[PDB]
Design a protein around this ligand. Structure first.
Ligand code: HEM
Ligand SMILES: CCCCCC/C=C/CCCCCCCC(=O)O
Length: 411
């Protein structure tokens, strides 16, 4: 099929997470052609389509997206835009800092932070979850990474990380906030990398700050100071971005009350299932872009070298073919469900060691479970009159108020 509208980029901004899905459903097809982001695109959805999108013999990520994404969200010429052995090499760096051990450690640091926070929340009237999550996440991320952070900087660093995240799919003021935060963050971290390399800053083998500063490329040389900084930021920023998910989890509890008790009469088993469903059900990652690097045919389409393609993350997560009642929050659906690498792709598909799939997925899940645990067992609270509406057009999305909690008491 071929949408020939000449304003599809504009429509993409108005429809956001539903742009691809509205059409694939309209054309009764898992693929369609369109002119987007100033390029000739093929948009696809579904697990099968995801499997092809991740075939690295047919797709490359270099030059696949407008540079505006690199100048806000990613950092210029970083891991997201690399291909081949070089990508895999650097990808191994990231992965080595996200193994189960680091995961466990980050969950641990979060559990401690939430416990301590109870003391202050009990004394406050209201608390904005998003705001509290960003700061705790930024505190933990930096400590675990060995990145010095003075209490006076916390808010400012956390705020800068979110501005980058919030600018990825925006135009205007929202996008500019990201353009201005990235250089502040980069210089801040670049100076640390350099201090570390001169031995003027204590670093610990095994920590992100350390590994990024001393990492060696396939050619034996260290990354440039700027790049090492950009890459450490691609570790820190995303951890702080977990705040969006933490908030959707609280939203889920509030909008679907039964699960609060469901969790309570439950184990970690049920927390896992709830967290899985939060990531599948709520919008965060919209779609991924790549370029056809060698002609091929799939599902009766001809992908020609040089063509841009968008893989629909959100739509796929809501595909009835693999998810019964896909538009409803039901962590029960995960009841001993077999793990699959493409039926659900909120953080990418395939294998993280064989593609660009998110290497921080385990960390995301463990931090989400630890945080969920806190909301369900460590405190009691009310959810006052507020705007909890989240947009499917706005990218990224977040319950409007940031999720205000009041009357907080230790349980
Ligand atoms: C807050 C929730 C998160 C979401 C929704 C998310 C989503 C994604 C998506 C969709 C991709 C692209 C996959 C592809 O290109 O095929 C990605 C890449 C990545 N994420 Fe996550 N991510 C999250 C958290 C994290 C965390 C906590 C870390 C750090 C520990 C992290 C580190 C990365 C890195 C380094 C990449 C790029 C890897 C590559 O290109 O090979 N992410 N993420
Ligand atoms: C014109 C809009 C283009 C949008 C491009 C979409 C890029 C994919 C986004 C991945 C979202 C990642 C979620 C936040 C994690 C992070 O901080 O990296």
């Amino acid at each position: 099929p071929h949408d020939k509208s000449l304003d599809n980029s504009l429509t993409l901004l108005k429809e956001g997470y539903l742009f691809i899905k509205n059409r694939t459903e309209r054309y009764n097809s898992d693929l369609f052609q369109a002119r987007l982001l100033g390029k000739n695109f093929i948009c696809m959805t579904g697990a099968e389509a995801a499997k092809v999108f991740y075939d690295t013999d047919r797709f490359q990520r270099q030059n696949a997206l407008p540079k505006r994404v690199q100048k806000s969200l990613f950092g210029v010429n970083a891991i997201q835009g690399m291909d081949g052995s070089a990508h895999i090499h650097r990808k191994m760096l990231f992965l080595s800092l996200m193994t189960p051990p680091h995961q466990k450690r980050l969950a641990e640091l979060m559990t401690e932070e939430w416990k301590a926070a109870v003391t202050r929340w009990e004394k406050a009237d209201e608390v904005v979850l998003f705001e509290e999550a960003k700061e705790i996440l930024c505190r933990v991320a930096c400590y675990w990474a060995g990145v010095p952070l003075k209490e006076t900087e916390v808010k400012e660093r956390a705020d800068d990380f979110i501005d980058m995240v919030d600018a990825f799919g925006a135009v205007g003021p929202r996008h500019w906030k990201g353009r201005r935060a990235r250089p502040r963050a980069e210089e801040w971290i670049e100076v640390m990398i350099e201090d570390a390399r001169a031995g003027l800053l204590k670093t610990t083998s095994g920590t992100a700050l350390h590994e990024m500063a001393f990492h060696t490329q396939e050619d034996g040389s260290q990354l440039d100071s700027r790049m090492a900084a950009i890459e450490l930021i691609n570790v820190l920023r995303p951890i702080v971005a977990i705040s969006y998910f933490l908030v959707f989890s609280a939203l889920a509890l509030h909008e679907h009350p039964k699960y609060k008790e469901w969790l309570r009469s439950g184990n970690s088993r049920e927390r896992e299932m709830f967290v899985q469903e939060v990531r599948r059900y709520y919008p965060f990652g919209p779609f991924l872009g790549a370029l056809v690097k060698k002609d091929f045919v799939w599902n009766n389409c001809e992908f020609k070298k040089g063509t841009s393609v968008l893989l629909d993350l959100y739509g796929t997560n809501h595909d009835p073919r693999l998810w019964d009642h896909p538009d409803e929050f039901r962590p029960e659906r995960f009841a001993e469900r077999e793990e699959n690498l493409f039926d659900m792709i909120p953080q990418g598909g395939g294998h993280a060691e064989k593609g660009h799939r998110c290497p921080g997925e385990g960390i995301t899940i463990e931090v989400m479970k630890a945080s969920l645990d806190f909301l369900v067992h460590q405190i009691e609270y009310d959810v006052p009159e507020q705007s909890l509406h989240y947009s499917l057009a706005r990218m990224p999305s977040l319950p409007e108020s940031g999720f205000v909690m009041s009357g907080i008491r230790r349980k």
